[PDB]
Design a protein around this ligand. Structure first.
Ligand SMILES: [Cl-]
Lengths: 170, 84
């Protein structure tokens, strides 16, 4: 939030602060594949909290492109994303939760093994969903099923421990 | 746990290799293992080059690194590239 806003105004923000009239794409000043994700990916995840235009547009578009094109750069940075994900979800804001769950869905298919490496952090990130469980209720279910699907053998029970009402058939 | 899947050796110096050389000199595979072993806010880096400036070793002594390239072509091939 405040950290993302400082980031946004710096020269080393890797996205060009321009709008092209043809479309809504973002233009990268620096090639994604040359960014050290250890530095840049946590900063973009810092902006999950952001709801103010134009910061939130660039936070969201930035996260998406970095997940889409991260390849093998994403998993090594997973440990540094837990605290930003947790801080965003724990605001208890429905709009932030909705965008964060869609981001998490993208994260677990972003690269191989990311879903499984997420399992030990379930207890840090899933609790607030119990406030919002069964629109957000359907999104929570769809997101938990994504986690289970790419989380390997130990996923279901660990989801169920934190989300006791969780049932699924996949 | 988040640990690399595979390891190869490098044969051409690069910005990536320089920073890997600095972590490995200090006893760490890469930044991921450094951040697992120690509690880190941000790694100290040189502004102009982005190179690792300072690292704390396992016995809690510190290594310092030059603003400019330290990895010799003759030492490049000793730097391990880890895959995840
Ligand atoms: Cl996304």
């Amino acid at each position: 939030s405040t950290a993302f806003r400082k980031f946004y105004e710096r020269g080393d923000f890797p996205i060009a602060l321009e709008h092209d009239s043809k479309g809504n794409k973002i233009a990268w000043k620096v090639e994604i594949e040359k960014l050290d994700y250890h530095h840049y990916l946590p900063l973009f995840f810092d902006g999950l909290c952001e709801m103010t235009f134009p910061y939130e547009f660039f936070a969201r578009q930035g996260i998406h492109d970095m997940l889409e094109h991260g390849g093998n750069k994403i998993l090594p940075v997973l440990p540094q994303l837990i605290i930003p994900i947790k801080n965003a979800l724990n605001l208890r804001n429905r709009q932030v939760i909705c965008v964060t769950l869609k981001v998490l869905q993208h994260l677990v298919v972003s690269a191989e093994m990311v879903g499984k490496a997420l399992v030990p952090f379930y207890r840090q990130i899933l609790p607030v969903l119990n406030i919002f469980k069964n629109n957000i209720g359907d999104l929570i279910q769809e997101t938990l099923e994504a986690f289970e699907r790419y989380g390997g053998e130990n996923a279901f029970i660990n989801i169920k421990y934190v989300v006791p009402t969780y049932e699924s058939c996949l | 746990d988040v640990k690399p899947k595979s390891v190869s050796h490098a044969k051409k110096w690069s910005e990536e290799i320089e920073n890997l050389y600095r972590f490995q000199q200090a006893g760490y595979r890469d930044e991921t293992e450094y951040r697992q072993v120690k509690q880190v806010s941000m790694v100290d880096r040189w502004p102009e080059t982005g190179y690792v400036k300072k690292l704390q070793r396992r016995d809690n002594t510190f290594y310092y690194y030059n603003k400019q390239r330290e990895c010799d072509d003759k030492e490049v091939h000793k730097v391990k590239i880890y895959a995840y």
